[PDB]
Design a protein around this motif. Structure first.
Motif, PDB file in Angstrom:
ATOM      1  N   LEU B   9      12.359  38.777 -45.375  1.00 49.83           N
ATOM      2  CA  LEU B   9      13.520  38.877 -46.231  1.00 49.83           C
ATOM      3  C   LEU B   9      14.821  39.028 -45.465  1.00 49.83           C
ATOM      4  O   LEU B   9      15.791  38.348 -45.761  1.00 49.83           O
ATOM      5  N   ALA B  10      14.879  39.863 -44.413  1.00 47.45           N
ATOM      6  CA  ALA B  10      16.048  40.036 -43.570  1.00 47.45           C
ATOM      7  C   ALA B  10      16.536  38.754 -42.887  1.00 47.45           C
ATOM      8  O   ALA B  10      17.737  38.499 -42.800  1.00 47.45           O
ATOM      9  N   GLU B  11      15.612  37.888 -42.421  1.00 54.24           N
ATOM     10  CA  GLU B  11      15.936  36.560 -41.917  1.00 54.24           C
ATOM     11  C   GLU B  11      16.594  35.683 -42.987  1.00 54.24           C
ATOM     12  O   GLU B  11      17.632  35.055 -42.763  1.00 54.24           O
ATOM     13  N   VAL B  12      16.032  35.683 -44.213  1.00 56.40           N
ATOM     14  CA  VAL B  12      16.577  35.026 -45.397  1.00 56.40           C
ATOM     15  C   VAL B  12      17.928  35.581 -45.860  1.00 56.40           C
ATOM     16  O   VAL B  12      18.869  34.833 -46.139  1.00 56.40           O
ATOM     17  N   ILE B  13      18.095  36.922 -45.915  1.00 57.71           N
ATOM     18  CA  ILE B  13      19.369  37.572 -46.209  1.00 57.71           C
ATOM     19  C   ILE B  13      20.420  37.224 -45.166  1.00 57.71           C
ATOM     20  O   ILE B  13      21.530  36.825 -45.510  1.00 57.71           O
ATOM     21  N   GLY B  14      20.078  37.277 -43.858  1.00 51.24           N
ATOM     22  CA  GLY B  14      20.986  36.915 -42.769  1.00 51.24           C
ATOM     23  C   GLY B  14      21.419  35.477 -42.809  1.00 51.24           C
ATOM     24  O   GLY B  14      22.591  35.153 -42.637  1.00 51.24           O
ATOM     25  N   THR B  15      20.469  34.577 -43.111  1.00 53.34           N
ATOM     26  CA  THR B  15      20.724  33.161 -43.358  1.00 53.34           C
ATOM     27  C   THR B  15      21.669  32.943 -44.524  1.00 53.34           C
ATOM     28  O   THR B  15      22.630  32.184 -44.439  1.00 53.34           O
ATOM     29  N   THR B  16      21.447  33.656 -45.644  1.00 48.12           N
ATOM     30  CA  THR B  16      22.314  33.627 -46.823  1.00 48.12           C
ATOM     31  C   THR B  16      23.719  34.140 -46.549  1.00 48.12           C
ATOM     32  O   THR B  16      24.710  33.528 -46.939  1.00 48.12           O
ATOM     33  N   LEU B  17      23.857  35.258 -45.806  1.00 47.88           N
ATOM     34  CA  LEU B  17      25.136  35.757 -45.328  1.00 47.88           C
ATOM     35  C   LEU B  17      25.869  34.778 -44.415  1.00 47.88           C
ATOM     36  O   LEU B  17      27.072  34.552 -44.569  1.00 47.88           O
ATOM     37  N   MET B  18      25.148  34.140 -43.471  1.00 45.59           N
ATOM     38  CA  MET B  18      25.673  33.101 -42.604  1.00 45.59           C
ATOM     39  C   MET B  18      26.193  31.864 -43.330  1.00 45.59           C
ATOM     40  O   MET B  18      27.295  31.386 -43.060  1.00 45.59           O
ATOM     41  N   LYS B  19      25.412  31.334 -44.293  1.00 52.18           N
ATOM     42  CA  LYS B  19      25.764  30.212 -45.152  1.00 52.18           C
ATOM     43  C   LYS B  19      26.908  30.482 -46.121  1.00 52.18           C
ATOM     44  O   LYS B  19      27.783  29.643 -46.340  1.00 52.18           O
ATOM     45  N   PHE B  20      26.937  31.679 -46.737  1.00 55.31           N
ATOM     46  CA  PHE B  20      28.022  32.125 -47.591  1.00 55.31           C
ATOM     47  C   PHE B  20      29.360  32.261 -46.857  1.00 55.31           C
ATOM     48  O   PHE B  20      30.408  31.857 -47.362  1.00 55.31           O
ATOM     49  N   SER B  21      29.342  32.822 -45.630  1.00 56.49           N
ATOM     50  CA  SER B  21      30.528  33.320 -44.937  1.00 56.49           C
ATOM     51  C   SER B  21      31.305  32.296 -44.124  1.00 56.49           C
ATOM     52  O   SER B  21      31.940  32.630 -43.127  1.00 56.49           O
ATOM     53  N   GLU B  22      31.327  31.017 -44.547  1.00 55.01           N
ATOM     54  CA  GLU B  22      32.263  30.025 -44.035  1.00 55.01           C
ATOM     55  C   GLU B  22      33.735  30.437 -44.177  1.00 55.01           C
ATOM     56  O   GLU B  22      34.106  31.209 -45.060  1.00 55.01           O
ATOM     57  N   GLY B  23      34.605  29.941 -43.272  1.00 53.75           N
ATOM     58  CA  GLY B  23      35.992  30.379 -43.146  1.00 53.75           C
ATOM     59  C   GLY B  23      36.123  31.637 -42.328  1.00 53.75           C
ATOM     60  O   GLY B  23      35.135  32.207 -41.862  1.00 53.75           O
ATOM     61  N   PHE B  24      37.363  32.088 -42.087  1.00 55.23           N
ATOM     62  CA  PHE B  24      37.637  33.239 -41.243  1.00 55.23           C
ATOM     63  C   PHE B  24      38.771  34.110 -41.768  1.00 55.23           C
ATOM     64  O   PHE B  24      39.153  35.103 -41.147  1.00 55.23           O
ATOM     65  N   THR B  25      39.293  33.811 -42.976  1.00 56.16           N
ATOM     66  CA  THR B  25      40.143  34.735 -43.727  1.00 56.16           C
ATOM     67  C   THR B  25      39.314  35.747 -44.487  1.00 56.16           C
ATOM     68  O   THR B  25      39.803  36.803 -44.886  1.00 56.16           O
ATOM     69  N   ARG B  26      38.012  35.456 -44.677  1.00 63.19           N
ATOM     70  CA  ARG B  26      37.046  36.321 -45.321  1.00 63.19           C
ATOM     71  C   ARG B  26      36.891  37.718 -44.730  1.00 63.19           C
ATOM     72  O   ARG B  26      37.011  37.931 -43.524  1.00 63.19           O
ATOM     73  N   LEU B  27      36.662  38.723 -45.598  1.00 63.50           N
ATOM     74  CA  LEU B  27      36.538  40.123 -45.217  1.00 63.50           C
ATOM     75  C   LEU B  27      35.370  40.416 -44.282  1.00 63.50           C
ATOM     76  O   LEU B  27      35.502  41.133 -43.290  1.00 63.50           O
ATOM     77  N   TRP B  28      34.184  39.849 -44.590  1.00 64.65           N
ATOM     78  CA  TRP B  28      32.950  40.105 -43.872  1.00 64.65           C
ATOM     79  C   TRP B  28      33.005  39.704 -42.387  1.00 64.65           C
ATOM     80  O   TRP B  28      33.464  38.597 -42.087  1.00 64.65           O
ATOM     81  N   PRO B  29      32.564  40.523 -41.435  1.00 64.00           N
ATOM     82  CA  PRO B  29      32.525  40.145 -40.031  1.00 64.00           C
ATOM     83  C   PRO B  29      31.157  39.593 -39.663  1.00 64.00           C
ATOM     84  O   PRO B  29      30.134  40.047 -40.172  1.00 64.00           O
ATOM     85  N   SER B  30      31.110  38.640 -38.718  1.00 61.64           N
ATOM     86  CA  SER B  30      29.915  38.022 -38.150  1.00 61.64           C
ATOM     87  C   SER B  30      28.907  39.039 -37.625  1.00 61.64           C
ATOM     88  O   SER B  30      27.695  38.886 -37.792  1.00 61.64           O
ATOM     89  N   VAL B  31      29.398  40.158 -37.044  1.00 62.77           N
ATOM     90  CA  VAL B  31      28.594  41.300 -36.615  1.00 62.77           C
ATOM     91  C   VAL B  31      27.705  41.885 -37.714  1.00 62.77           C
ATOM     92  O   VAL B  31      26.561  42.250 -37.460  1.00 62.77           O
ATOM     93  N   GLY B  32      28.159  41.956 -38.988  1.00 58.11           N
ATOM     94  CA  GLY B  32      27.321  42.430 -40.095  1.00 58.11           C
ATOM     95  C   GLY B  32      26.104  41.567 -40.343  1.00 58.11           C
ATOM     96  O   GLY B  32      24.996  42.050 -40.574  1.00 58.11           O
ATOM     97  N   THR B  33      26.281  40.236 -40.261  1.00 57.59           N
ATOM     98  CA  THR B  33      25.202  39.250 -40.250  1.00 57.59           C
ATOM     99  C   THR B  33      24.279  39.412 -39.044  1.00 57.59           C
ATOM    100  O   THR B  33      23.056  39.354 -39.165  1.00 57.59           O
ATOM    101  N   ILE B  34      24.834  39.682 -37.838  1.00 57.16           N
ATOM    102  CA  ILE B  34      24.061  40.017 -36.636  1.00 57.16           C
ATOM    103  C   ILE B  34      23.201  41.270 -36.818  1.00 57.16           C
ATOM    104  O   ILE B  34      22.036  41.297 -36.429  1.00 57.16           O
ATOM    105  N   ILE B  35      23.721  42.333 -37.466  1.00 61.61           N
ATOM    106  CA  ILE B  35      22.957  43.524 -37.836  1.00 61.61           C
ATOM    107  C   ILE B  35      21.772  43.213 -38.745  1.00 61.61           C
ATOM    108  O   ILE B  35      20.673  43.730 -38.551  1.00 61.61           O
TER     109      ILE B  35
END
Ligand SMILES: Fc1ccc([P+](c2ccc(F)cc2)(c2ccc(F)cc2)c2ccc(F)cc2)cc1
Lengths: 102, 102
Positions: B9-35
């Motif tokens: 599930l964590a691999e799937v959640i991380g994949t979903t976070l990665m796919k969702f988080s296109e752009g770089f004005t977005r609040l979420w940091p890449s490090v949260g996906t790395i966690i």
């Protein structure tokens, strides 16, 4: 050397590296698995960038299953007839059937 | 337990976070996906406390072929054919055997 083949090797070697004794093991860094995960995920990212994603993942499971099972039986002397392995054969046969239609 | 399902599930959640988080004005940091990715490996380590490596791999592969199928298809199509139903059922049967081990 090729990214996809490296990615297939990275798991098979990586798990084989994790399977070391609670005793002493020659040449094993204690940060090694963590390095292996970092290497594996970098190789995967290259692999999915430059090869079709469904093809790469289908090949990676396909080769990896045969390679680990042959390596584990052949050189580590492991059983193919134990209860879990009998269920695993049905998964691997079912995986082949979907992969033939892909 | 819930560790093996959580690790997958964590691999799937991380994949979903990665796919969702296109752009770089977005609040979420890449490090949260790395966690979330770091968590998957740590959850696998928690899984391998009482579960053998191959048994954990077989269940992950049984879900993994479904993950390959969803990736291959995108949106759902028409109902499955007879060999595909058998191949999927063989994966279901193998998981049923593995989860009925004591
Ligand atoms: F599209 C994909 C394809 C594969 C994976 P993979 C993988 C790829 C290459 C490698 F060298 C070692 C592990 C994985 C699992 C949890 C993670 F946090 C990150 C990656 C993985 C491990 C075991 C398994 F049974 C199935 C997939 C992830 C996304």
């Amino acid at each position: 050397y090729i990214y996809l083949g490296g990615a297939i090797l990275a798991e098979v070697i990586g798990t084989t590296l994790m399977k070391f004794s609670e005793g002493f093991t020659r040449l094993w860094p204690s940060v090694g698995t963590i390095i292996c995960y970092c290497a594996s995920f970098w190789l995967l990212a290259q692999t999915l960038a430059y090869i079709p994603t469904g093809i790469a993942y289908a090949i990676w499971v396909g080769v990896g299953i045969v390679l680990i099972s042959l390596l584990s039986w052949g050189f580590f002397g492991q059983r193919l007839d134990l209860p879990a392995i009998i269920g695993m054969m049905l998964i691997c046969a079912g995986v082949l059937i979907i992969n033939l239609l892909s």
